[PDB]
Design a protein around this ligand. Sequence first.
Ligand SMILES: Nc1ncnc2c1ncn2[C@@H]1O[C@H](COP(=O)(O)OP(=O)(O)O)[C@@H](O)[C@H]1O
Ligand SMILES: [Mg+2]
Lengths: 52, 147, 55, 54, 351, 55, 254
Amino acid sequence: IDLEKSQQALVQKRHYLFDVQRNNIAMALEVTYRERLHRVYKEIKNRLDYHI
Amino acid sequence: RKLALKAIDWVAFGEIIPRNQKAIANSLKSWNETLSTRLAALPEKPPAIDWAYYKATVAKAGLVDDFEKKFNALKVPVPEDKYTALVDAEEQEDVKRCAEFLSLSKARIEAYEKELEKMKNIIPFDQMTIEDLNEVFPETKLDKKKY
Amino acid sequence: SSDTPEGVRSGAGAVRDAGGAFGKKEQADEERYFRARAREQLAALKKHHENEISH
Amino acid sequence: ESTTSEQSARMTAMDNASKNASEMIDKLTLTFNRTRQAVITKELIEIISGAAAL
Amino acid sequence: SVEQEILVTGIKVVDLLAPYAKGGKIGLFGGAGVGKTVLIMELINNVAKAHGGYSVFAGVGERTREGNDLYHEMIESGVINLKDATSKVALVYGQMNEPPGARARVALTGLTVAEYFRDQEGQDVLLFIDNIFRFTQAGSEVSALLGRIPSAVGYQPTLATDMGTMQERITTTKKGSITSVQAIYVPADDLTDPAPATTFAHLDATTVLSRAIAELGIYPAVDPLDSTSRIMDPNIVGSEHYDVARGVQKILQDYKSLQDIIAILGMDELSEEDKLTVSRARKIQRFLSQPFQVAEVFTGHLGKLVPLKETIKGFQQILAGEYDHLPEQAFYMVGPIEEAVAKADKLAEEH
Amino acid sequence: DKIRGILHRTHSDQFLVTFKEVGRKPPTFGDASVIALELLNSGYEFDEGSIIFNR
Amino acid sequence: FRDNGKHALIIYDDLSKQAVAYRQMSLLLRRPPGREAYPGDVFYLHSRLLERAAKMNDAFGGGSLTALPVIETQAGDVSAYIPTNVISITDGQIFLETELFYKGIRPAINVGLSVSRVGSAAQTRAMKQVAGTMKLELAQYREVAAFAQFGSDLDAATQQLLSRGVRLTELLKQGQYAPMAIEEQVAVIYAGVRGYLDKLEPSKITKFENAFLSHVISQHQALLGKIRADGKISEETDAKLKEIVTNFLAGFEA
Ligand SMILES: Nc1ncnc2c1ncn2[C@@H]1O[C@H](COP(=O)(O)OP(=O)(O)O)[C@@H](O)[C@H]1O
Ligand SMILES: [Mg+2]
């Protein structure tokens, strides 16, 4: 009994953490694209603030 | 913008069980909590660029509008996804290796299950046999049992 | 007095600021004890072997 | 026996050192209160005498 | 102006626990005979010769002897030059032999010359004022003949208005910057007197001197648990300097509450865990004392000047425990932490 | 300690051994064996004696 | 803002420099002095300024005005002239000492001498439930604070009372310019007053708290919307918060 569940324990463990590695890198590209759209507004706000 | 969901990071995803490598699994959950707050720091949409008030307030013209004409039709190329596939590639090889316990020990379960069938057979009658009881309790060659 | 915010209450470090009998008995006991620790830490500091080869 | 004889006399000799330090702490509270009133009284006279002579 | 900096001096107690600032008003408190004139003679020695712009010294109500030991310690160092036009210091003097109508208009004459350099020119100016308690006292003498009722303990009724009318011209504006160091006499060791306890609102960095430290031999006697600054801030001095400053004050204040136990129990009956926080605190008291340069004729010792990066690294290692094998005397009147072990071996051999 | 500290003047030459660090932690039977062992293997062969304490 | 149904707040920084700027005007107008050369009506100067703070009712608009005056004592003597006028006018005091500021307690609020006489009738239902035991727990600690310097031969209840008092203190320390929310405040107090910290080392209570707060903002946002909007903490949220601080405490040290 204890070695039958030892089969099934590693097949629910592995598919959870192999999609966490999908989504831990998925957030790494959104927060570097959201900060790409935001920064290009910041360095054109400096010229909208300087000449006044 | 675009934003996809994920699964539960509750029990399995922090118990990856390396060779006493609970520190590497602890670092795996630490990146998800950091990036979700950095995604909560900035929204999906940035601020809007008012164009009409730029012409009157910065009315020294030419040098003000030429930067506003070049920076308006620009594009922001995000970083590459070259490391996105190779990290997902090793998950495909390990998932084929993780079922080896489900492949090899399945016969070890049924051989242990068939061993429980023959173990019922051996005990039999109290006064049964002097050789059928000579499977579990052992015998050996000359001069084994010291005491 | 002290069982109200109004009355006088004593703080930490008030035996030495008074400067009486217990304030002088405390200064000469921190010195007569840490004088012997300048003996045992200096006698064992001469046990560096490289200095003895120079000697 | 000697560590019981010693540990009971540490109980008594630390008890009379808190009675004598609380008997002394009320006698200095009255002198603090006579002297606290006497300074408000004294520096009130100096302001009145300074204004009357002016 | 709104910007803040840090001006490095070279004194170990000042740069660690209460850093000074460029263009900021600095105060030197303490009683009579603890070292306010020597510590204000030290900052002309370090700061004024490495400084680019000019410097002004106004002396208000002090001994006429000590205005001659400044005119003769600034010719032999070449700051005042009697032969050409390359001097860098002006001097304004109204001393304690003057009538009391003249000890209350000299400090207004000091910061009028020092307002010309900041405004009509653009240079960075310093300003040293000693003493400034004799501006308040010299107005409390002409008062009762002008027809005014006295306030609390004997000062004039207009005490905190003409003080605040002078102390609002010593500022950093958008046309220049005035660093200012001031010595403030505290009468008979009471910081609740109405003349020193209203200058606190006009000072950024206060350096409270004390007679209870000076009678131990710890020189300069600066109180660590009574000196503040406005830039003790982990966003300005960095997070490494900040957790060292508060680590020193926490072990000194916890040393204060332990002295109340040793008076009844004794030193040896304590545990081994707090026999160590005393011995770490006593090495921090003695390491703060530094041999000054202009106090050579008192001491005979040499003048040390520890930089800022070395002051932090000296105090991390006494706290972490890397010098538990030395006696207390190896840190008394030393410079950097390198001389604390060289002085440790030289004491050993004479046994 | 405080037996040796009192008698350090009048009887400093009649001491055999002195045992310090006594009374901080509660006494046990092993410390009664450490003292009684060193009373034998000292070189002083005695023939009577007495003990004084506070019952 | 009080007359037009809105809410307000005012801070006098500070009131001990108004009694001095008014004393100078009196003694130059030749008025009869009094104690410490203050005039006879310095009580009437501060009373009719603080009595203008009021909680109006619904027939007049429902407005309000809240007043926080600052008063500087000298050498911690509140029995002076002006520190006793403004104490007897207002409701409660917050007494910041200088000894606790250097012992590590920042903000250095002494809760032994600080009171408020509106009492618990101004707390929300969530904060009132946990802090009613915390106030009793801290007050039992301050009785036995003088046994900490030499205590190992005491009863296990007294060792427990010291053990909870130190760890509740570390929850009260707070950096500058970081104000929290009431729903995040009640969660940190709930982690401490229940007993979920008596095995964690007393130096780690700050590092545990900054780790735990950044967790529940991103991963349990739907629980801190059912204490903000509910106002109280129910039986459903009592179990839901219970496995949260048990899940985090289990794998924490990494
Ligand atoms: N570097 C120093 N450290 C400690 N004490 C000093 C130092 N220099 C001078 N003193 C002491 O300070 C006393 C007063 O010096 P000074 O600063 O001239 O007077 P004041 O501070 O009262 O104006 C002297 O008696 C001297 O012993
Ligand atoms: Mg002087």
